[PDB]
């Protein structure tokens, strides 16, 4: 099974990249259910994570760096929901764009990555229930998994990546 992200404009085949981690935001306020939605503040959050490749993207780190043995989540303050959660992967997930306006990600590989990221967020926050919800909303560069590629700029809808619960 596969997950197809709608991207406009259509990225060419040679923008087929590796996802090496992402950036989350814990939704504040208030059941023992913690809710994370992919961060989309300003380019400086994505910068500060420093698991950043030359490819200047949002939501997901494309062609960034990988951790060693396993997933490592990081934050400047676990209590400040304003402060993002830099998730860094160990083993990358391939995003492949057919150039028909569609980019594809293995459902297996991604679900696996969520399981792990959930586990670590659980260690940190001590809860039981980890909910991934889509982008909270904002300017188009963030509310969508955006990126540059060959000088051209693309956007992708990613609400299909972040919509699950874990226990």
């Amino acid at each position: 099974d596969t997950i197809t992200l709608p991207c406009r404009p259509a990225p060419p085949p040679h923008c087929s990249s590796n996802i090496t981690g992402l950036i989350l935001t814990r939704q504040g306020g208030y059941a023992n259910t913690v809710i994370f939605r992919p961060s989309g503040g300003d380019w400086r959050d994505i910068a500060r994570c420093q698991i950043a490749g030359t490819v200047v993207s949002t939501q997901l780190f494309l062609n960034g760096s990988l951790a060693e043995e396993e997933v490592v989540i990081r934050s400047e303050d676990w209590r400040d929901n304003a402060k993002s959660i830099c998730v860094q992967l160990a083993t990358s997930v391939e995003i492949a764009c057919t150039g028909a306006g569609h980019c594809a990600i293995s459902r297996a590989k991604w679900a696996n990555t969520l399981k792990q990221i959930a586990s670590k967020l659980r260690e940190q926050y001590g809860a039981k229930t980890i909910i991934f919800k889509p982008s909270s909303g904002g300017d188009p560069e963030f509310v969508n998994h955006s990126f540059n590629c060959g000088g051209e700029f693309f956007y992708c809808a990613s609400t299909q990546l972040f919509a699950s619960t874990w226990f």
Partner: antibody
Amino acid sequence: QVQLQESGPGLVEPSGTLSLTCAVSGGSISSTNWWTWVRQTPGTGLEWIGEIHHSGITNYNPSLKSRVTISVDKSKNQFSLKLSSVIAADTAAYYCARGDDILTGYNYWGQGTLVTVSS
Amino acid sequence: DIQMTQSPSSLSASVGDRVSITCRASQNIINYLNWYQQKPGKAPKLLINAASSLQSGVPSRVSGSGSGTDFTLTISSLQSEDFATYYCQQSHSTPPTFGQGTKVEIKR
């Protein structure tokens, strides 16, 4: 080393638009850096306007979004600032400066150019 | 925006003296703070980045410290040619905010 010189008119009567060009010498605008415009007014201080990546990405100060445009001319090896609907409030000195991988520091600056909004 | 309040705004020291300028940020900005020197009618000169990394080309007299909500610029042996205004600058989050400035006047 890298060097920046601004160019463009130091007078713009109200309503109209301020066009201004940073010419980059001894370094490409197609590097790994961002390129920034900052204005400075006596009494008011330093205000960051916006920045642009070599890949057409554009960050603008919230306060000026409705009015501001930054562009990259890769053929001429320059970048440019265009402010529409200018008011007397915009009477200031306009610098083009190159940071260093949006890592904090605005490393090299241009000599800046003064711009009056007067009729 | 992140509010950068310098301290003081205007000071008066001697040739050889030790100058200290503070910069308080509204939010925790980690260590993403930069110090600029600007002499009259000239473009700002990057003294310090990351609140401590002496930009190459500046004297070692100049030094930087702090991390969080408070930072310090120190000039450990002031000279005739340090007559300038000094600015602390945000870098953690757009917009990069600046400080109002500190006016170091040489006393003689």
